[PDB]
């Protein structure tokens, strides 16, 4: 709907955030219209004065997920912080968690080859993999937690 | 979260394995006819 995108252009930042939440519920159906307006949602995520930055990031990450651009979807999902819940049984969350584990394992593997370049692993990506390993441990799925801990090169979580 | 995180790669690896097998078999048969 071009009515929610128009509400994002208004100076009531809170009302723009409300329009963004309205587009979030509707992100599954309205992603082809929202994709044209990604630069407006990116500008709302970059704006330091906006209290609801994590909700803008979550709408952007859902739009990139429906576009098929999982890397940018992950970068914005890491921007959403507390609004990205690992507990949610959504196809969006599963695909992004799988991609987050793969990127984390790839970065950890490279950081161990290059003894001279500490590839700066985003602490947000580490925190998602931690919560997922803890979920697998709480679910009694120890064999999966061990497989993931071996891929992630995390000896401490393997011991746990 | 283990169901949606770890087991997900089993359904992914097999899809590429199935096409790699067929491509390798086709190339191997093309080379085998010539070798024979």
């Amino acid at each position: 709907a071009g009515g929610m995108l128009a509400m994002l252009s208004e100076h009531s930042t809170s009302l723009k955030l409300h329009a963004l939440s309205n587009l979030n519920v509707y992100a599954q159906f309205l992603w082809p219209e929202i994709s044209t307006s990604i630069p407006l949602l990116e500008s709302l995520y970059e704006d330091e004065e906006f209290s609801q930055r994590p909700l803008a990031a979550l709408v952007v990450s859902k739009v990139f997920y429906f576009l098929g651009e999982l890397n940018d979807s992950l970068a914005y999902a890491l921007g959403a912080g507390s609004l990205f819940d690992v507990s949610e049984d959504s196809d969006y969350v599963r695909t992004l968690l799988d991609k987050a584990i793969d990127e984390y394992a790839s970065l950890r593997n490279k950081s161990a080859e290059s003894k001279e370049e500490a590839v700066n692993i985003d602490p947000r990506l580490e925190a998602i993999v931690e919560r997922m390993l803890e979920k697998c441990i709480l679910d009694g799925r120890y064999q999966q937690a061990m497989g993931m801990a071996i891929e992630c090169r995390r000896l401490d979580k393997l011991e746990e | 979260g283990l169901r949606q995180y770890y087991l997900q790669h089993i359904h992914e690896l097999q899809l590429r394995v199935r096409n790699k097998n067929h491509n390798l078999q086709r190339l191997e048969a093309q080379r085998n006819d010539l070798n024979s």
């Binding site: 064999q143 999966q144 | 790699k20 191997e28 093309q30 080379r31």
Partner: peptide
């Protein structure tokens, strides 16, 4: 065991992957 099915599947897929270079070598030597 539950994680074994994925680890073994990955091992076999990786092993079959080298088959590409294996075949390519003979495709030129032949």
């Amino acid at each position: 065991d539950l994680y074994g099915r994925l680890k073994s599947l990955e091992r076999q897929i990786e092993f079959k992957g080298i088959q590409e270079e294996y075949v390519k070598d003979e495709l030129k030597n032949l």
